[PDB]
Amino acid sequence: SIDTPNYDVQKHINKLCGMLLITEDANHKFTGLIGMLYAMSRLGREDTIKILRDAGYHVKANGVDVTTHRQDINGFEVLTLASLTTEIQINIEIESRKSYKKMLKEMGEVAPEYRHDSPDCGMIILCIAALVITKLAAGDRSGLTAVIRRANNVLKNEMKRYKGLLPKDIANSFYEVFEKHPHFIDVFVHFGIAQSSTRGGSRVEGIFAGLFMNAYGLE
C-alpha cells in the first residue's frame, strides 16, 4: 500500500515542506517521506503508478485527498496518507506556527522568501535528496559527511532563509526512506530526469537540476 498523490495536492505538500523548513530544531523523522510525496505529486498519480509498475513493483495505490480535521487544543487541513498520520501532520503545523510567530515578532512582516508557503519549499527538501542519491552508490551511510559539506555550500542562501534546513537531519531522513522503501529511488530518479528538463526563473529549481546532473561528481 503506497500513497500516490496527484497534482491537486502539490500545493499542500509544498506548504508541509515549508512548515518543516521554518521550524527551529525541526524533527526531520518524516522529511524523507514528505519530500518523496512532493516528488510524486509533481510527477502526478498516473506517471507515479507507471514508474512503479514498470520498475516491477506491485502497487496498491492510495488516493490522497485534503480533509479538514477538527482538533481544538488551546483555542486543520490534512492529507489522507497511509504513511503519515493526522496527528503527525497537525503537530508539524503546530510547531511551525510557533516558529512563524517568533519570526513575525523579531522582524515584523515575514518576507515572501522566509515563509512556509514559498513556491520553492518542496524543491529545497528535494535538493538534499539529490545529494543523498549521489552518495547511495556506496551501499552504506558513509557519504553523509560529504552530503553535509556539499549542502552547506550549494544551499547557503536557502539555509540563511530557513532555520529548519538542517542538512544532517534531512540527509539521514532520505537515507532512511531509500533504505526502507527502495521503490522511492526509482520515483526520485524519474522525477529528477523530468524536472531537469524544465527551465524557469526559480533559483532552487536550477540548483536541483545542477545537483541531480552531478557533472562534477563523475569528474
Curated annotation (Swiss-Prot):
Q: What the entry says about post-translational processing?
A: Tyrosine phosphorylation modulates viral transcription and replication.
- By which gene is this protein encoded? N
Entire protein: which part is shown?
Answer: 32 to 252 of 391
* Subunit record text: Homomultimerizes to form the nucleocapsid. Binds to viral genomic RNA. Interacts (via N-terminus) with the phosphoprotein P (via C-terminus); the phosphorylated phosphoprotein P binds to N-RNA complex. When in a monomeric RNA-free form, interacts with the phosphoprotein (via N-terminus). Interacts with protein M2-1; this interaction allows the association of nucleocapsid with the matrix protein. Interacts with host EIF2AK2/PKR; this interaction inhibits EIF2AK2 phosphorylation of EIF2S1 and blocks EIF2AK2-mediated translation shutoff.
Q: Which residue positions does Phosphotyrosine occur at?
A: 7
A biological process (GO) of this protein is: symbiont-mediated suppression of host cytoplasmic pattern recognition receptor signaling pathway via inhibition of MDA-5 activity
- Spell out the molecular function terms from Gene Ontology: protein serine/threonine kinase inhibitor activity; RNA binding
Q: What is its main location?
A: virion
Q: What is the effect of changing residue 97 to A?
A: Almost complete loss of viral RNA synthesis
Task: Write down the superkingdom of origin.
Answer: Viruses
User: Segment Interaction with the phosphoprotein: which positions?
Assistant: 1-217
Explain the purpose of this protein: Encapsidates the viral RNA genome by forming a left-handed helical nucleocapsid that protects the RNA from nucleases. RNA replication depends on the availability of soluble nucleoprotein. The encapsidated genomic RNA is termed the NC and serves as template for transcription and replication. Together with the phosphoprotein, sequesters host NF-kappa-B in inclusion bodies (IBs) thereby inhibiting this host defense pathway. May also act as a modulator of the innate immune response by sequestration of host IFIH1/MDA5 and MAVS into IBs.
Write the lineage as a comma-separated list. Answer: Viruses, Riboviria, Orthornavirae, Negarnaviricota, Haploviricotina
**Where does it localize?**
Virion; Host cytoplasm
What is this protein's name? Nucleoprotein
Name any GO cellular component annotation: viral nucleocapsid
Q: Which family does it belong to?
A: Belongs to the paramyxoviruses nucleocapsid family.
Q: Can the keyword Phosphoprotein be found in this entry's annotation?
A: yes
Q: Which UniProt keywords apply?
A: Capsid protein, Helical capsid protein, Host cytoplasm, Host-virus interaction, Inhibition of host innate immune response by virus, Inhibition of host interferon signaling pathway by virus, Inhibition of host MAVS by virus, Inhibition of host MDA5 by virus, Inhibition of host NF-kappa-B by virus, Inhibition of host PKR by virus, Inhibition of host RLR pathway by virus, Interferon antiviral system evasion, Phosphoprotein, Ribonucleoprotein, RNA-binding, Viral immunoevasion, Viral nucleoprotein, Virion
